[PDB]
């Protein structure tokens, strides 16, 4: 009766789609072949799966999801894979050659060729829905398709669907790690495009999560397969309301009203607690308040910028499992009390709150263990201006030499657009800086007797 569309773009995106849908079947009791475990009727009514899967056939549940990369490998490994009977083959879309870490290939000379093919299958999945809520879109900034084909797709999505929300869900590039040299150019050339077209973006970071995997989770040798399974436990908790009833409910069109004080500042960071082995949960009790304070510790944040380095503007709490609303109100009030947990000096009502009755299930035999209660959190903060400044500095150092430029400009893209993308991010640095000002409107600042 209301519905969501998911989109997986580039090898990050696809591999998270191959992690998230796995969880989504268990979270609904669906099987790896889109069946319920049984033919014969049990229980009565919902079947709360309508917002995620179209029901077909003898009660075969088809996930509401389109997949794109311009290499076929990554989608051929789903087409031949474990979940080969869950996904629909029209919705598994492949290219002939990857954008090869080049935005101009991603966005133009290769990416142009299947944009209408992708959009028509998106049309066909929208015409399948009873009430479209909008789009959740998955990529990285590193990728040439994760940048090029995402940005192209969100331009097209605004033609076809106008005001309908478009929420981004993205592997934000790390502060000292990279897997690629040209990552800072693909990182800007997408952002320059999607700020004027998407409604939010919720960041998460490889190196941050690597740190948490080792420090907290006790995982010495973490994989991407842990990474994306921790990332699926994020977006399961951002979509718990759209899957279950709960004491407080938060729709896909809520989060933008809450988290976005001006359309330029639409880039929160996503955090989740607790993240530990079972072996550590036997020396803990994990109260509501405990886990809510754990979502603020700098060592627990899943974007690596330190939240001491700026000021909160906006927050959303997203609880699951054994949580009651008083316990939360007191967790929030005592974090609010801490003016070390500092908010921008204009923000009064900093928090939004969701509460689901249903706990997260985990995948069997794997690295993630059960808890009695859990919290995701989404927070917009001035402290991330150090990582945007990292994406400044990394662009500026190579672009002063015009290094790697000939790959993008050899796809016919222009030096003019390249410079405007950097200029839009020089405006973005002043956008973060102004929200950082304590609403100054004269020649100094003022105070009472004591703070």
């Amino acid at each position: 009766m209301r519905e969501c569309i998911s989109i997986h773009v580039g090898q990050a995106g696809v591999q998270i789609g191959n992690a998230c849908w796995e969880l989504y079947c268990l979270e609904h009791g669906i099987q790896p072949d889109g069946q319920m475990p049984s033919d014969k009727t049990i229980g009565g009514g919902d079947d709360s799966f309508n917002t995620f899967f179209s029901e077909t056939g003898a009660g075969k549940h088809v996930p509401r999801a389109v997949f794109v990369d311009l290499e076929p490998t990554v989608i051929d490994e789903v087409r031949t894979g474990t979940y080969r009977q869950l996904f629909h083959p029209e919705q598994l879309i492949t290219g002939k050659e990857d954008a090869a870490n080049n935005y101009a290939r991603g966005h133009y000379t290769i990416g142009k060729e299947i944009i209408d093919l992708v959009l028509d299958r998106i049309r066909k999945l929208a015409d399948q829905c009873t009430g479209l809520q909008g789009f959740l879109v998955f990529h990285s900034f590193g990728g040439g398709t994760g940048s090029g084909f995402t940005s192209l797709l969100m331009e097209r999505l605004s033609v076809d669907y106008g005001k309908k929300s478009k929420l981004e869900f993205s592997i934000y590039p790390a502060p000292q790690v990279s897997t690629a040299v040209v990552e800072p150019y693909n990182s800007i050339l997408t952002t320059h495009t999607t700020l004027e077209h998407s409604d939010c973006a919720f960041m998460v970071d490889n190196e941050a999560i690597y740190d948490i995997c080792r420090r907290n989770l006790d995982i010495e040798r973490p994989t991407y397969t842990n990474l994306n399974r921790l990332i699926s436990q994020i977006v399961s908790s951002i979509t718990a309301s759209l899957r279950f009833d709960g004491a407080l409910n938060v729709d896909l069109t809520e989060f933008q009203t809450n988290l976005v004080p001006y359309p330029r500042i639409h880039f929160p960071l996503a955090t989740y607690a607790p993240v530990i082995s079972a072996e550590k949960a036997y020396h803990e009790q994990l109260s509501v308040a405990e886990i809510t304070n754990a979502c603020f510790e700098p060592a627990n944040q899943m974007v690596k910028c330190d939240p001491r380095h700026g000021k909160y503007m906006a927050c959303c709490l997203l609880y699951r499992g054994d949580v009651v609303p008083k316990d939360v109100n007191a967790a929030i009030a005592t974090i609010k009390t801490k003016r070390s947990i500092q908010f921008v000096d204009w923000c009064p009502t900093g928090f939004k709150v969701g509460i689901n009755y249903q706990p997260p299930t985990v995948v069997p035999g794997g690295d993630l263990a059960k808890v009695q209660r859990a919290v995701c959190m989404l927070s917009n903060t001035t402290a991330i201006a150090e990582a945007w400044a990292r994406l400044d500095h990394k662009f500026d150092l190579m672009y002063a030499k015009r290094a790697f430029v000939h790959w993008y400009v050899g796809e016919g893209m222009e030096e003019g657009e390249f410079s405007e993308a950097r200029e839009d991010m020089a405006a973005l640095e002043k956008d973060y800086e102004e929200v950082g000002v304590d609403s100054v409107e004269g020649e100094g600042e003022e105070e009472g007797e004591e703070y």
Binding site: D245, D251, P325, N329
Partner: protein, 445 residues
């Protein structure tokens, strides 16, 4: 014969809706099938107040349910008592509200208010005499907030000479549940001050004190909170449904409790409230009610009314009470708190006393006060507004619905006027005679 319409709107509004419809139905021995089974003949007597008759001993409530999504109402329809309701009266969107009050008042609630007024025309014309509408909504919310404002904007002129009784959960005194709370609330009151006859202010943070202090709960749910405001709603409307020794209905309550046409913001309170243990370690009497009924920490607004002055009070008792023992405790309060009432309104209390107590109680009282203290809420709401509006933050989601950036300031100007009205009456002096200069004159030396 005398009748009420119920409306529920927004998540909180449909949760206090689903619990009020448990409370009142069980108080009538209405079964969850919608079958009448009341264990007194006096339950069937005024059943038309809250219900309409159907085929074969079935009844449906005169309750109308609104949303911009299916999701909350699905849990009504599946949850307990869900089957008393007429499924025609379920009026819900497939759109969301986004915590955007403009998305309700101007655009996507505007795409459905005509389907709500549809059910108001069907049900309100079951009534011999409609006395009023009873509306459970949000104020700081986006759903309930955004739906009641446009709805009253139409019910207040189809039915201009009926009453309009609102229960509104308000923004919290120390936290937020939603980011945009200051905006939704300031813009809702700008409509509702002009058009409501009664608004209770209901505060979770006040309720959560009670759950810690009087009820002594460890994991207090929303359900627990919802049983106390539905017990409030049942309580204030007890004399509408049963005999009493001192009757009153919504019209009798408003004329004693609203002294000027904007000063209809009320705090409730409820008595008794103890824990499941501590009940046994005090007595229960008229003074034991009163001991808790006036007591500022037990108000369901955390205003600590000893900051301000009561204009007017209403006390609505249930169970066999003795008139001299009630009348004299209402006055004992007034003398021994004489510094906490308005000057130019004496005899401050409207006392109503009804026969039939709650289910699982022998006595209770519902407390309704009017004190200029209530400025505490709306002041934070104004300060948390201009904090946001001095920079025009969040505005682009409201202009994205057509809302003019000027009506934010018409509301701020209205909030300055309204808040200043509590201050112009707080400790305001009376008209009496002045000073006279006089001294002795020489007669002898």
């Amino acid at each position: 014969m005398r009748e009420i319409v119920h409306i529920q709107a927004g998540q909180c509004g449909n949760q206090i809706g689903a619990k009020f419809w448990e409370v009142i139905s069980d108080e009538h021995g209405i079964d969850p099938t919608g079958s009448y089974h009341g264990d007194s003949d006096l339950q069937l007597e005024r059943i038309n107040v809250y219900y309409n008759e159907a085929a074969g001993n079935k009844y449906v409530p005169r309750a109308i349910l609104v949303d911009l999504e299916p999701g909350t109402m699905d849990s009504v329809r599946s949850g307990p008592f869900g089957q008393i309701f007429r499924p025609d009266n379920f009026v819900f969107g497939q759109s969301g509200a986004g915590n955007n009050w403009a998305k309700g008042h101007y655009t996507e609630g505007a795409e459905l208010v005509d389907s709500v007024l549809d059910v108001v025309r069907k049900e309100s014309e079951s009534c011999d005499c409609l006395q009023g509408f009873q509306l459970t909504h949000s104020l700081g919310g986006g759903t309930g907030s955004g739906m009641g404002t446009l709805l009253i904007s139409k019910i207040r002129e189809e039915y201009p000479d009926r009453i309009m009784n609102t229960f509104s959960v308000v923004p919290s005194p120390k936290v937020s549940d939603t980011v945009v709370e200051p905006y939704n609330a300031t813009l809702s009151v700008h409509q509702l001050v002009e058009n409501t006859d009664e608004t209770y202010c209901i505060d979770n943070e006040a309720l959560y004190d009670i759950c810690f202090r009087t009820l002594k709960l460890t994991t207090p749910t929303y359900g627990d909170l919802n049983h106390l405001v539905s017990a409030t709603m049942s309580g204030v409307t007890t004399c509408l449904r049963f005999p009493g020794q001192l009757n009153a209905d919504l019209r009798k309550l408003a004329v004693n409790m609203v002294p000027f046409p904007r000063l209809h913001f009320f705090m409730p309170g409820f008595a008794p409230l103890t824990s499941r243990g501590s009940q046994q370690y005090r007595a229960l009497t008229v003074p034991e009610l009163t001991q808790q009924m006036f007591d500022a920490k037990n108000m369901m607004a955390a205003c600590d009314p000893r900051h301000g002055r009561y204009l007017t009070v209403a006390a609505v008792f249930r169970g066999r009470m003795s008139m001299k023992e009630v009348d004299e405790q209402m006055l004992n309060v007034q003398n021994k708190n004489s510094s906490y009432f308005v000057e130019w309104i004496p005899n401050n209390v409207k006392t109503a006393v009804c026969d039939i107590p709650p289910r699982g109680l022998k006595m209770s009282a519902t407390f309704i006060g009017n004190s200029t203290a209530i400025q505490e809420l709306f002041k934070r709401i104004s300060e948390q507004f201009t904090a946001m509006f001095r920079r025009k933050a969040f505005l682009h989601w409201y202009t994205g619905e057509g809302m003019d950036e000027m009506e934010f300031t018409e509301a701020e100007s209205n909030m300055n006027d309204l808040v200043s009205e509590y201050q112009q009456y707080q400790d305001a002096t009376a008209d009496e005679q002045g000073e006279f200069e006089e001294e002795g004159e020489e007669d002898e030396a």
